mmCIF file of C-alpha atoms in Angstrom:
data_model
loop_
_atom_site.group_PDB
_atom_site.id
_atom_site.type_symbol
_atom_site.label_atom_id
_atom_site.label_comp_id
_atom_site.label_asym_id
_atom_site.label_seq_id
_atom_site.Cartn_x
_atom_site.Cartn_y
_atom_site.Cartn_z
ATOM 1 C CA UNK A 1 -24.690 -27.521 -6.967
ATOM 2 C CA UNK A 2 -22.883 -26.997 -3.894
ATOM 3 C CA UNK A 3 -23.202 -30.253 -1.863
ATOM 4 C CA UNK A 4 -25.113 -29.952 1.085
ATOM 5 C CA UNK A 5 -23.769 -31.349 3.990
ATOM 6 C CA UNK A 6 -20.063 -30.798 4.051
ATOM 7 C CA UNK A 7 -17.850 -27.645 3.550
ATOM 8 C CA UNK A 8 -16.289 -26.419 0.393
ATOM 9 C CA UNK A 9 -13.343 -23.506 1.290
ATOM 10 C CA UNK A 10 -11.860 -21.476 -1.441
ATOM 11 C CA UNK A 11 -8.643 -19.474 -0.536
ATOM 12 C CA UNK A 12 -5.644 -17.959 -2.677
ATOM 13 C CA UNK A 13 -2.841 -20.110 -3.467
ATOM 14 C CA UNK A 14 -0.157 -17.667 -1.142
ATOM 15 C CA UNK A 15 -2.193 -18.358 2.112
ATOM 16 C CA UNK A 16 -1.876 -21.210 4.342
ATOM 17 C CA UNK A 17 -4.225 -23.409 3.433
ATOM 18 C CA UNK A 18 -2.801 -26.426 4.443
ATOM 19 C CA UNK A 19 -3.111 -24.887 8.191
ATOM 20 C CA UNK A 20 -6.187 -24.143 7.232
ATOM 21 C CA UNK A 21 -7.198 -27.501 6.160
ATOM 22 C CA UNK A 22 -5.664 -28.880 9.706
ATOM 23 C CA UNK A 23 -8.766 -26.389 11.337
ATOM 24 C CA UNK A 24 -10.782 -27.914 8.786
ATOM 25 C CA UNK A 25 -9.914 -31.721 10.156
ATOM 26 C CA UNK A 26 -10.471 -30.367 13.677
ATOM 27 C CA UNK A 27 -13.880 -29.149 12.598
ATOM 28 C CA UNK A 28 -14.893 -32.814 11.244
ATOM 29 C CA UNK A 29 -13.777 -34.353 14.267
ATOM 30 C CA UNK A 30 -15.895 -32.441 16.924
ATOM 31 C CA UNK A 31 -18.932 -32.709 13.947
ATOM 32 C CA UNK A 32 -18.244 -35.340 11.248
ATOM 33 C CA UNK A 33 -18.739 -32.798 8.717
ATOM 34 C CA UNK A 34 -15.917 -33.115 6.077
ATOM 35 C CA UNK A 35 -14.082 -29.572 5.072
ATOM 36 C CA UNK A 36 -11.888 -29.233 1.883
ATOM 37 C CA UNK A 37 -10.112 -26.394 1.089
ATOM 38 C CA UNK A 38 -9.087 -25.685 -2.391
ATOM 39 C CA UNK A 39 -7.268 -22.772 -3.800
ATOM 40 C CA UNK A 40 -7.958 -22.373 -7.768
ATOM 41 C CA UNK A 41 -5.863 -19.717 -9.415
ATOM 42 C CA UNK A 42 -7.930 -16.561 -10.015
ATOM 43 C CA UNK A 43 -10.454 -17.702 -7.447
ATOM 44 C CA UNK A 44 -11.393 -13.739 -7.152
ATOM 45 C CA UNK A 45 -12.290 -13.901 -10.521
ATOM 46 C CA UNK A 46 -14.118 -17.777 -10.752
ATOM 47 C CA UNK A 47 -15.854 -17.283 -7.786
ATOM 48 C CA UNK A 48 -18.488 -14.594 -9.814
ATOM 49 C CA UNK A 49 -18.826 -17.148 -12.367
ATOM 50 C CA UNK A 50 -19.814 -20.297 -11.028
ATOM 51 C CA UNK A 51 -21.322 -18.276 -7.920
ATOM 52 C CA UNK A 52 -23.679 -16.433 -10.747
ATOM 53 C CA UNK A 53 -25.319 -19.823 -11.607
ATOM 54 C CA UNK A 54 -25.626 -20.971 -7.878
ATOM 55 C CA UNK A 55 -22.283 -22.767 -7.499
ATOM 56 C CA UNK A 56 -18.838 -22.540 -6.191
ATOM 57 C CA UNK A 57 -17.397 -23.092 -2.720
ATOM 58 C CA UNK A 58 -19.742 -22.603 0.677
ATOM 59 C CA UNK A 59 -17.059 -20.113 1.814
ATOM 60 C CA UNK A 60 -14.451 -17.687 -0.187
ATOM 61 C CA UNK A 61 -11.814 -15.937 1.328
ATOM 62 C CA UNK A 62 -9.895 -13.046 -0.037
ATOM 63 C CA UNK A 63 -9.109 -8.842 -0.044
ATOM 64 C CA UNK A 64 -12.093 -6.956 1.518
ATOM 65 C CA UNK A 65 -12.031 -5.140 -1.704
ATOM 66 C CA UNK A 66 -13.454 -8.004 -4.072
ATOM 67 C CA UNK A 67 -16.431 -8.468 -1.756
ATOM 68 C CA UNK A 68 -18.529 -5.143 -2.064
ATOM 69 C CA UNK A 69 -18.865 -6.521 -6.056
ATOM 70 C CA UNK A 70 -19.808 -10.091 -5.035
ATOM 71 C CA UNK A 71 -22.379 -8.683 -2.587
ATOM 72 C CA UNK A 72 -24.037 -6.000 -4.646
ATOM 73 C CA UNK A 73 -25.023 -8.833 -7.255
ATOM 74 C CA UNK A 74 -26.375 -10.751 -4.107
ATOM 75 C CA UNK A 75 -23.510 -13.391 -4.193
ATOM 76 C CA UNK A 76 -22.885 -13.315 -0.694
ATOM 77 C CA UNK A 77 -25.059 -13.809 2.468
ATOM 78 C CA UNK A 78 -25.550 -11.472 5.037
ATOM 79 C CA UNK A 79 -23.371 -12.736 8.280
ATOM 80 C CA UNK A 80 -24.726 -12.302 11.794
ATOM 81 C CA UNK A 81 -22.663 -12.331 14.309
ATOM 82 C CA UNK A 82 -24.163 -11.243 18.031
ATOM 83 C CA UNK A 83 -22.753 -9.035 19.852
ATOM 84 C CA UNK A 84 -20.109 -11.145 21.947
ATOM 85 C CA UNK A 85 -18.637 -12.424 19.044
ATOM 86 C CA UNK A 86 -18.607 -8.914 17.358
ATOM 87 C CA UNK A 87 -16.787 -7.698 20.366
ATOM 88 C CA UNK A 88 -13.813 -9.933 19.555
ATOM 89 C CA UNK A 89 -12.559 -8.444 16.380
ATOM 90 C CA UNK A 90 -11.816 -5.167 15.844
ATOM 91 C CA UNK A 91 -14.531 -2.659 14.951
ATOM 92 C CA UNK A 92 -12.731 -1.256 11.739
ATOM 93 C CA UNK A 93 -11.994 -4.493 10.371
ATOM 94 C CA UNK A 94 -16.295 -4.951 10.691
ATOM 95 C CA UNK A 95 -16.580 -2.056 8.660
ATOM 96 C CA UNK A 96 -14.044 -3.328 5.822
ATOM 97 C CA UNK A 97 -16.971 -5.836 5.442
ATOM 98 C CA UNK A 98 -19.871 -3.672 5.641
ATOM 99 C CA UNK A 99 -21.873 -3.103 2.422
ATOM 100 C CA UNK A 100 -24.561 -1.025 2.521
ATOM 101 C CA UNK A 101 -25.379 -1.130 5.908
ATOM 102 C CA UNK A 102 -24.665 -5.312 6.056
ATOM 103 C CA UNK A 103 -22.079 -7.195 7.279
ATOM 104 C CA UNK A 104 -20.699 -9.384 4.200
ATOM 105 C CA UNK A 105 -17.873 -11.588 5.534
ATOM 106 C CA UNK A 106 -15.822 -12.497 8.714
ATOM 107 C CA UNK A 107 -12.676 -9.875 8.978
ATOM 108 C CA UNK A 108 -9.366 -12.080 9.630
ATOM 109 C CA UNK A 109 -6.374 -10.774 8.824
ATOM 110 C CA UNK A 110 -5.093 -6.989 7.930
ATOM 111 C CA UNK A 111 -2.402 -7.268 5.189
ATOM 112 C CA UNK A 112 -0.353 -4.627 4.569
ATOM 113 C CA UNK A 113 3.035 -4.870 2.139
ATOM 114 C CA UNK A 114 6.517 -4.262 3.745
ATOM 115 C CA UNK A 115 9.786 -3.953 3.088
ATOM 116 C CA UNK A 116 12.275 -6.705 3.761
ATOM 117 C CA UNK A 117 15.689 -6.937 3.658
ATOM 118 C CA UNK A 118 18.719 -8.940 3.722
ATOM 119 C CA UNK A 119 20.501 -7.667 6.893
ATOM 120 C CA UNK A 120 23.777 -9.604 5.899
ATOM 121 C CA UNK A 121 24.199 -7.909 2.345
ATOM 122 C CA UNK A 122 22.577 -4.219 3.890
ATOM 123 C CA UNK A 123 23.196 -3.684 7.344
ATOM 124 C CA UNK A 124 20.763 -0.749 7.099
ATOM 125 C CA UNK A 125 17.641 -0.262 4.993
ATOM 126 C CA UNK A 126 17.447 2.665 2.996
ATOM 127 C CA UNK A 127 14.682 5.375 4.199
ATOM 128 C CA UNK A 128 13.390 6.977 0.819
ATOM 129 C CA UNK A 129 12.959 5.405 -2.771
ATOM 130 C CA UNK A 130 15.362 8.398 -3.974
ATOM 131 C CA UNK A 131 18.567 6.760 -2.665
ATOM 132 C CA UNK A 132 17.986 2.979 -4.122
ATOM 133 C CA UNK A 133 19.820 3.596 -7.553
ATOM 134 C CA UNK A 134 22.322 4.227 -6.033
ATOM 135 C CA UNK A 135 22.504 1.833 -3.465
ATOM 136 C CA UNK A 136 21.770 -0.724 -6.473
ATOM 137 C CA UNK A 137 25.373 0.622 -8.272
ATOM 138 C CA UNK A 138 27.100 -0.267 -5.327
ATOM 139 C CA UNK A 139 25.695 -3.871 -5.019
ATOM 140 C CA UNK A 140 26.035 -4.762 -8.765
ATOM 141 C CA UNK A 141 29.772 -3.782 -8.133
ATOM 142 C CA UNK A 142 29.862 -6.779 -6.137
ATOM 143 C CA UNK A 143 26.930 -8.686 -8.304
ATOM 144 C CA UNK A 144 24.091 -8.105 -6.326
ATOM 145 C CA UNK A 145 21.182 -5.803 -7.157
ATOM 146 C CA UNK A 146 19.315 -3.527 -4.493
ATOM 147 C CA UNK A 147 15.502 -4.568 -5.225
ATOM 148 C CA UNK A 148 13.250 -7.093 -6.534
ATOM 149 C CA UNK A 149 9.632 -7.125 -6.769
ATOM 150 C CA UNK A 150 6.356 -8.647 -8.261
ATOM 151 C CA UNK A 151 6.336 -5.625 -10.875
ATOM 152 C CA UNK A 152 2.725 -7.259 -12.608
ATOM 153 C CA UNK A 153 0.195 -6.991 -10.060
ATOM 154 C CA UNK A 154 -0.660 -3.568 -9.099
ATOM 155 C CA UNK A 155 -0.588 -4.406 -5.629
ATOM 156 C CA UNK A 156 2.931 -4.183 -5.874
ATOM 157 C CA UNK A 157 3.553 -1.191 -7.272
ATOM 158 C CA UNK A 158 0.696 1.121 -6.010
ATOM 159 C CA UNK A 159 2.326 1.996 -2.493
ATOM 160 C CA UNK A 160 5.098 4.441 -4.679
ATOM 161 C CA UNK A 161 2.483 5.133 -7.122
ATOM 162 C CA UNK A 162 -0.046 6.292 -4.182
ATOM 163 C CA UNK A 163 2.642 7.907 -2.123
ATOM 164 C CA UNK A 164 2.637 11.427 -3.218
ATOM 165 C CA UNK A 165 -1.023 11.679 -4.486
ATOM 166 C CA UNK A 166 -2.881 8.709 -5.727
ATOM 167 C CA UNK A 167 -5.459 7.263 -4.611
ATOM 168 C CA UNK A 168 -8.431 4.498 -5.661
ATOM 169 C CA UNK A 169 -11.728 6.403 -6.079
ATOM 170 C CA UNK A 170 -12.285 10.347 -4.484
ATOM 171 C CA UNK A 171 -14.219 9.733 -1.143
ATOM 172 C CA UNK A 172 -16.404 12.924 -0.011
ATOM 173 C CA UNK A 173 -19.278 12.647 2.515
ATOM 174 C CA UNK A 174 -20.109 8.520 3.257
ATOM 175 C CA UNK A 175 -19.763 8.061 -0.663
ATOM 176 C CA UNK A 176 -17.142 7.560 -3.102
ATOM 177 C CA UNK A 177 -17.292 8.863 -6.286
ATOM 178 C CA UNK A 178 -16.856 6.397 -9.066
ATOM 179 C CA UNK A 179 -15.690 9.064 -11.981
ATOM 180 C CA UNK A 180 -12.926 10.523 -10.045
ATOM 181 C CA UNK A 181 -9.761 8.305 -10.247
ATOM 182 C CA UNK A 182 -6.914 9.059 -8.321
ATOM 183 C CA UNK A 183 -4.163 8.018 -10.684
ATOM 184 C CA UNK A 184 -5.427 10.595 -13.292
ATOM 185 C CA UNK A 185 -2.519 13.546 -11.019
ATOM 186 C CA UNK A 186 1.108 14.741 -10.524
ATOM 187 C CA UNK A 187 1.630 12.750 -7.620
ATOM 188 C CA UNK A 188 0.672 9.717 -9.132
ATOM 189 C CA UNK A 189 2.249 10.421 -12.659
ATOM 190 C CA UNK A 190 5.931 11.095 -10.446
ATOM 191 C CA UNK A 191 5.167 7.925 -8.960
ATOM 192 C CA UNK A 192 4.953 5.551 -11.834
ATOM 193 C CA UNK A 193 7.469 7.795 -13.351
ATOM 194 C CA UNK A 194 10.192 6.846 -10.533
ATOM 195 C CA UNK A 195 8.892 3.425 -11.474
ATOM 196 C CA UNK A 196 9.358 3.156 -14.591
ATOM 197 C CA UNK A 197 12.710 5.151 -14.351
ATOM 198 C CA UNK A 198 13.922 2.492 -12.005
ATOM 199 C CA UNK A 199 13.372 -0.155 -14.767
ATOM 200 C CA UNK A 200 14.867 2.342 -17.850
ATOM 201 C CA UNK A 201 18.327 2.714 -15.999
ATOM 202 C CA UNK A 202 18.511 -1.133 -15.803
ATOM 203 C CA UNK A 203 17.460 -1.153 -11.455
ATOM 204 C CA UNK A 204 14.888 -3.591 -12.226
ATOM 205 C CA UNK A 205 13.047 -5.811 -14.853
ATOM 206 C CA UNK A 206 9.976 -4.983 -16.310
ATOM 207 C CA UNK A 207 8.963 -8.679 -16.406
ATOM 208 C CA UNK A 208 9.669 -9.569 -12.759
ATOM 209 C CA UNK A 209 7.128 -11.387 -10.726
ATOM 210 C CA UNK A 210 5.997 -12.857 -7.635
ATOM 211 C CA UNK A 211 8.339 -16.101 -8.519
ATOM 212 C CA UNK A 212 10.965 -14.742 -10.062
ATOM 213 C CA UNK A 213 11.319 -11.855 -7.036
ATOM 214 C CA UNK A 214 10.961 -14.542 -4.570
ATOM 215 C CA UNK A 215 13.187 -16.549 -5.943
ATOM 216 C CA UNK A 216 16.283 -13.536 -5.978
ATOM 217 C CA UNK A 217 15.654 -12.759 -2.657
ATOM 218 C CA UNK A 218 15.776 -15.804 -0.976
ATOM 219 C CA UNK A 219 19.078 -16.669 -2.791
ATOM 220 C CA UNK A 220 20.607 -13.484 -1.455
ATOM 221 C CA UNK A 221 20.855 -12.389 -4.946
ATOM 222 C CA UNK A 222 18.934 -9.184 -4.222
ATOM 223 C CA UNK A 223 19.552 -6.837 -1.281
ATOM 224 C CA UNK A 224 15.597 -5.941 -0.519
ATOM 225 C CA UNK A 225 12.138 -7.240 -2.148
ATOM 226 C CA UNK A 226 8.509 -5.994 -1.024
ATOM 227 C CA UNK A 227 5.813 -8.430 0.105
ATOM 228 C CA UNK A 228 2.927 -9.109 2.825
ATOM 229 C CA UNK A 229 3.384 -11.490 5.755
ATOM 230 C CA UNK A 230 2.409 -14.560 3.873
ATOM 231 C CA UNK A 231 5.903 -14.565 2.394
ATOM 232 C CA UNK A 232 7.572 -14.867 5.195
ATOM 233 C CA UNK A 233 7.434 -18.325 5.329
ATOM 234 C CA UNK A 234 9.515 -19.534 2.519
ATOM 235 C CA UNK A 235 12.394 -16.294 3.570
ATOM 236 C CA UNK A 236 12.397 -18.658 6.775
ATOM 237 C CA UNK A 237 13.306 -21.783 5.436
ATOM 238 C CA UNK A 238 15.883 -20.029 3.096
ATOM 239 C CA UNK A 239 17.510 -19.441 6.140
ATOM 240 C CA UNK A 240 18.071 -15.407 5.210
ATOM 241 C CA UNK A 241 19.131 -12.942 7.729
ATOM 242 C CA UNK A 242 16.185 -10.489 7.078
ATOM 243 C CA UNK A 243 14.086 -7.714 8.498
ATOM 244 C CA UNK A 244 10.634 -6.466 8.142
ATOM 245 C CA UNK A 245 10.651 -2.639 8.314
ATOM 246 C CA UNK A 246 8.727 0.728 7.141
ATOM 247 C CA UNK A 247 8.612 1.036 3.047
ATOM 248 C CA UNK A 248 10.426 3.973 1.854
ATOM 249 C CA UNK A 249 9.130 7.182 1.521
ATOM 250 C CA UNK A 250 8.911 8.987 -1.898
ATOM 251 C CA UNK A 251 9.216 12.581 -2.430
ATOM 252 C CA UNK A 252 9.298 12.514 1.332
ATOM 253 C CA UNK A 253 5.878 11.157 2.103
ATOM 254 C CA UNK A 254 5.113 7.624 3.413
ATOM 255 C CA UNK A 255 4.444 4.685 0.753
ATOM 256 C CA UNK A 256 0.926 3.886 0.752
ATOM 257 C CA UNK A 257 0.325 0.268 0.373
ATOM 258 C CA UNK A 258 -3.497 -0.535 -0.037
ATOM 259 C CA UNK A 259 -4.573 -2.230 3.122
ATOM 260 C CA UNK A 260 -6.710 -5.575 2.472
ATOM 261 C CA UNK A 261 -8.332 -6.980 4.833
ATOM 262 C CA UNK A 262 -8.674 -10.928 4.519
ATOM 263 C CA UNK A 263 -11.958 -12.083 4.662
ATOM 264 C CA UNK A 264 -14.181 -15.115 4.617
ATOM 265 C CA UNK A 265 -17.509 -14.818 2.731
ATOM 266 C CA UNK A 266 -20.324 -16.979 2.717
ATOM 267 C CA UNK A 267 -21.953 -17.857 -0.694
ATOM 268 C CA UNK A 268 -25.696 -16.607 -1.485
ATOM 269 C CA UNK A 269 -26.489 -19.948 -2.483
ATOM 270 C CA UNK A 270 -24.745 -22.019 -0.005
ATOM 271 C CA UNK A 271 -26.712 -24.375 1.635
ATOM 272 C CA UNK A 272 -24.590 -24.874 4.562
ATOM 273 C CA UNK A 273 -24.619 -21.454 5.906
ATOM 274 C CA UNK A 274 -25.247 -22.275 9.331
ATOM 275 C CA UNK A 275 -22.110 -24.581 9.117
ATOM 276 C CA UNK A 276 -19.893 -22.186 7.844
ATOM 277 C CA UNK A 277 -20.959 -19.543 10.332
ATOM 278 C CA UNK A 278 -20.350 -22.050 13.170
ATOM 279 C CA UNK A 279 -16.358 -23.291 11.426
ATOM 280 C CA UNK A 280 -15.966 -19.793 11.057
ATOM 281 C CA UNK A 281 -17.003 -18.108 14.246
ATOM 282 C CA UNK A 282 -16.224 -20.940 16.939
ATOM 283 C CA UNK A 283 -13.213 -22.660 15.087
ATOM 284 C CA UNK A 284 -11.454 -20.297 12.705
ATOM 285 C CA UNK A 285 -11.874 -17.050 14.414
ATOM 286 C CA UNK A 286 -9.968 -18.166 17.727
ATOM 287 C CA UNK A 287 -6.423 -18.190 18.738
ATOM 288 C CA UNK A 288 -5.930 -21.732 17.866
ATOM 289 C CA UNK A 289 -7.681 -21.521 14.953
ATOM 290 C CA UNK A 290 -5.663 -18.180 13.546
ATOM 291 C CA UNK A 291 -2.419 -19.672 14.694
ATOM 292 C CA UNK A 292 -3.192 -23.154 12.824
ATOM 293 C CA UNK A 293 -2.902 -20.810 9.743
ATOM 294 C CA UNK A 294 -0.537 -18.762 11.047
ATOM 295 C CA UNK A 295 2.194 -21.701 11.307
ATOM 296 C CA UNK A 296 1.408 -22.705 7.445
ATOM 297 C CA UNK A 297 1.821 -19.660 6.198
ATOM 298 C CA UNK A 298 1.615 -16.246 8.554
ATOM 299 C CA UNK A 299 -1.248 -13.953 8.312
ATOM 300 C CA UNK A 300 0.490 -11.108 9.687
ATOM 301 C CA UNK A 301 -1.748 -8.571 11.346
ATOM 302 C CA UNK A 302 -5.105 -10.460 12.344
ATOM 303 C CA UNK A 303 -8.751 -8.958 13.162
ATOM 304 C CA UNK A 304 -8.893 -10.812 16.418
ATOM 305 C CA UNK A 305 -8.251 -8.886 18.855
ATOM 306 C CA UNK A 306 -6.858 -11.883 21.466
ATOM 307 C CA UNK A 307 -4.151 -13.123 18.807
ATOM 308 C CA UNK A 308 -3.548 -9.509 17.441
ATOM 309 C CA UNK A 309 -1.875 -8.531 20.843
ATOM 310 C CA UNK A 310 -0.043 -11.496 20.918
ATOM 311 C CA UNK A 311 1.515 -11.168 17.541
ATOM 312 C CA UNK A 312 2.461 -7.638 18.484
ATOM 313 C CA UNK A 313 5.358 -8.679 20.472
ATOM 314 C CA UNK A 314 6.843 -9.550 17.290
ATOM 315 C CA UNK A 315 8.544 -6.731 15.399
ATOM 316 C CA UNK A 316 7.472 -8.016 11.678
ATOM 317 C CA UNK A 317 4.142 -7.739 13.006
ATOM 318 C CA UNK A 318 4.745 -4.169 14.419
ATOM 319 C CA UNK A 319 6.261 -3.205 10.960
ATOM 320 C CA UNK A 320 3.006 -4.537 9.033
ATOM 321 C CA UNK A 321 0.781 -2.507 11.332
ATOM 322 C CA UNK A 322 3.123 0.578 10.646
ATOM 323 C CA UNK A 323 2.691 0.318 6.919
ATOM 324 C CA UNK A 324 -0.883 -0.444 7.458
ATOM 325 C CA UNK A 325 -1.103 3.136 9.480
ATOM 326 C CA UNK A 326 0.438 4.832 6.807
ATOM 327 C CA UNK A 327 -1.399 3.419 3.783
ATOM 328 C CA UNK A 328 -5.244 3.244 3.982
ATOM 329 C CA UNK A 329 -7.964 0.426 3.852
ATOM 330 C CA UNK A 330 -9.134 0.064 -0.074
ATOM 331 C CA UNK A 331 -12.799 0.624 -0.820
ATOM 332 C CA UNK A 332 -14.897 -2.262 -1.197
ATOM 333 C CA UNK A 333 -17.123 -1.103 -3.788
ATOM 334 C CA UNK A 334 -18.095 -2.856 -7.196
ATOM 335 C CA UNK A 335 -15.630 -0.701 -9.092
ATOM 336 C CA UNK A 336 -12.614 -1.698 -7.396
ATOM 337 C CA UNK A 337 -12.011 -4.640 -9.580
ATOM 338 C CA UNK A 338 -12.156 -2.283 -12.817
ATOM 339 C CA UNK A 339 -9.592 -0.106 -10.922
ATOM 340 C CA UNK A 340 -6.791 -2.351 -10.197
ATOM 341 C CA UNK A 341 -7.158 -3.531 -13.714
ATOM 342 C CA UNK A 342 -7.141 -0.292 -15.102
ATOM 343 C CA UNK A 343 -3.877 0.194 -12.836
ATOM 344 C CA UNK A 344 -2.251 -3.165 -13.603
ATOM 345 C CA UNK A 345 -2.496 -2.280 -17.890
ATOM 346 C CA UNK A 346 -1.186 1.376 -16.933
ATOM 347 C CA UNK A 347 1.631 -0.063 -15.329
ATOM 348 C CA UNK A 348 2.835 -2.485 -17.673
ATOM 349 C CA UNK A 349 2.104 -0.532 -20.856
ATOM 350 C CA UNK A 350 4.582 2.233 -18.766
ATOM 351 C CA UNK A 351 6.970 -0.096 -17.770
ATOM 352 C CA UNK A 352 7.166 -1.637 -21.564
ATOM 353 C CA UNK A 353 7.761 1.597 -22.807
ATOM 354 C CA UNK A 354 4.449 1.025 -24.931
ATOM 355 C CA UNK A 355 2.860 4.194 -23.298
ATOM 356 C CA UNK A 356 4.077 7.604 -21.692
ATOM 357 C CA UNK A 357 3.269 7.668 -18.054
ATOM 358 C CA UNK A 358 0.988 10.279 -18.495
ATOM 359 C CA UNK A 359 -1.045 8.388 -21.566
ATOM 360 C CA UNK A 360 -1.186 5.417 -19.585
ATOM 361 C CA UNK A 361 -2.312 6.886 -15.946
ATOM 362 C CA UNK A 362 -5.023 9.415 -18.477
ATOM 363 C CA UNK A 363 -6.211 6.179 -20.041
ATOM 364 C CA UNK A 364 -6.197 4.311 -16.503
ATOM 365 C CA UNK A 365 -8.607 7.087 -15.384
ATOM 366 C CA UNK A 366 -10.907 6.428 -18.444
ATOM 367 C CA UNK A 367 -10.921 2.704 -18.209
ATOM 368 C CA UNK A 368 -11.447 2.173 -14.500
ATOM 369 C CA UNK A 369 -14.186 5.204 -13.882
ATOM 370 C CA UNK A 370 -16.290 4.160 -17.045
ATOM 371 C CA UNK A 371 -19.965 2.776 -16.730
ATOM 372 C CA UNK A 372 -19.111 -0.424 -18.253
ATOM 373 C CA UNK A 373 -15.439 -1.694 -17.580
ATOM 374 C CA UNK A 374 -13.293 -2.786 -20.668
ATOM 375 C CA UNK A 375 -13.132 -6.453 -18.758
ATOM 376 C CA UNK A 376 -16.743 -6.961 -18.613
ATOM 377 C CA UNK A 377 -17.547 -5.288 -21.787
ATOM 378 C CA UNK A 378 -15.376 -7.870 -23.395
ATOM 379 C CA UNK A 379 -17.509 -10.431 -21.688
ATOM 380 C CA UNK A 380 -20.830 -8.741 -22.542
ATOM 381 C CA UNK A 381 -18.974 -8.910 -26.090
ATOM 382 C CA UNK A 382 -18.349 -12.461 -25.873
ATOM 383 C CA UNK A 383 -21.950 -14.076 -25.284
ATOM 384 C CA UNK A 384 -23.311 -11.765 -27.465
ATOM 385 C CA UNK A 385 -21.501 -13.465 -30.254
ATOM 386 C CA UNK A 386 -23.000 -16.473 -28.895
ATOM 387 C CA UNK A 387 -26.796 -15.268 -27.943
ATOM 388 C CA UNK A 388 -27.620 -11.953 -29.052
ATOM 389 C CA UNK A 389 -31.238 -12.127 -27.444
ATOM 390 C CA UNK A 390 -31.415 -11.945 -23.512
ATOM 391 C CA UNK A 391 -33.702 -14.620 -21.748
ATOM 392 C CA UNK A 392 -34.983 -12.728 -18.393
ATOM 393 C CA UNK A 393 -32.986 -15.231 -16.277
ATOM 394 C CA UNK A 394 -29.667 -15.497 -18.392
ATOM 395 C CA UNK A 395 -29.648 -11.409 -18.189
ATOM 396 C CA UNK A 396 -29.778 -11.891 -14.651
ATOM 397 C CA UNK A 397 -26.902 -14.672 -14.935
ATOM 398 C CA UNK A 398 -24.651 -12.625 -17.269
ATOM 399 C CA UNK A 399 -25.329 -9.488 -14.784
ATOM 400 C CA UNK A 400 -23.452 -11.194 -11.397
ATOM 401 C CA UNK A 401 -20.573 -12.350 -13.312
ATOM 402 C CA UNK A 402 -19.420 -9.415 -14.978
ATOM 403 C CA UNK A 403 -20.193 -7.362 -12.095
ATOM 404 C CA UNK A 404 -23.090 -5.179 -13.424
ATOM 405 C CA UNK A 405 -26.887 -4.136 -12.737
ATOM 406 C CA UNK A 406 -29.361 -6.229 -14.574
ATOM 407 C CA UNK A 407 -30.412 -3.331 -16.147
ATOM 408 C CA UNK A 408 -26.854 -2.227 -17.332
ATOM 409 C CA UNK A 409 -26.973 -5.488 -19.220
ATOM 410 C CA UNK A 410 -30.101 -5.152 -20.734
ATOM 411 C CA UNK A 411 -29.729 -1.451 -21.921
ATOM 412 C CA UNK A 412 -26.633 -2.653 -23.469
ATOM 413 C CA UNK A 413 -27.658 -5.757 -26.064
ATOM 414 C CA UNK A 414 -30.413 -3.616 -26.834
ATOM 415 C CA UNK A 415 -28.345 -0.581 -28.339
ATOM 416 C CA UNK A 416 -25.980 -3.645 -29.646
ATOM 417 C CA UNK A 417 -28.876 -4.660 -31.783
ATOM 418 C CA UNK A 418 -29.903 -1.152 -32.399
#
């Protein structure tokens, strides 16, 4: 499918899609080419589905960690910016979107979580995670709570979990070791344990999510929250006197948020590749372009040098870059999705008192390191139930959507048939 002659962009629902739509209208003004911006729920999971079959949006926005998986499967077109445009962005953001020596997306924003606090409830933010339980007690006596943040998505709990030892995939030389998952150690264990103790001691609720945490903070019901720059927009409208600062340390170590580089990748099947290139390069990645999105929902730090240095004057931007510096850029290898799924499962099962922190982290290591991830194996299990004989073309398709090589798909199936 993919209608030729226009542009269909997918971007997460928490970003400034309305602002990106504005950039689209401008593009339509100078070119006549219509651009529609959609924000499908779970787009990072949907993209590989439809893209595998040659469908989907012309352009996809998302943290670079998912992109390596997409490009390995042939779903992302290689972008070819010339020397001049390439110079307009920071080299480290370009490296984030480089897979197997190729550039597979245009870097946009450098995202990192920060500690967001209410200056009226709390004159001075806590320097450590350790003092927070005590702060909560002080605040509970006044009918308020110290902290609330999304506990459902690992992105928000990883900073504390990795603070003292956690890591995605062991990195030696220029290659990651996909069998060495760093959730399998004492540092990570202590961090998740601290998290569960906060929940067990009633300082947080195991069910709190993005909406609940945001609602609570924007109402002045909780003293602090943990979120990205995109969430600043709603806090401004709530008229809360907030500040954005460094994340609390744990065991003396800085919280280590995984830095995500929001990037725009071009669908390998798009018949509008030159248009997407032009829209992104000459329209979006300009001070006017980024600002249009920013005004809707803040991008936070950015990849465009010119605009990044203007934003640097904003203390919230500084805080964001502070946290970015203390954390680290996430890997973009195909195994990242299994990593996240693994951690997501661990945190929830541990926070629910279903599994011990230790048993949870051990299974996370097993799940994330599996040659075939649990999700995907499940995908393969479905399908097989429908068709137990793979067509040379269908297998190539299943590989793409699952994120495994055609070879793996083919060997499974044969093993499944023995």
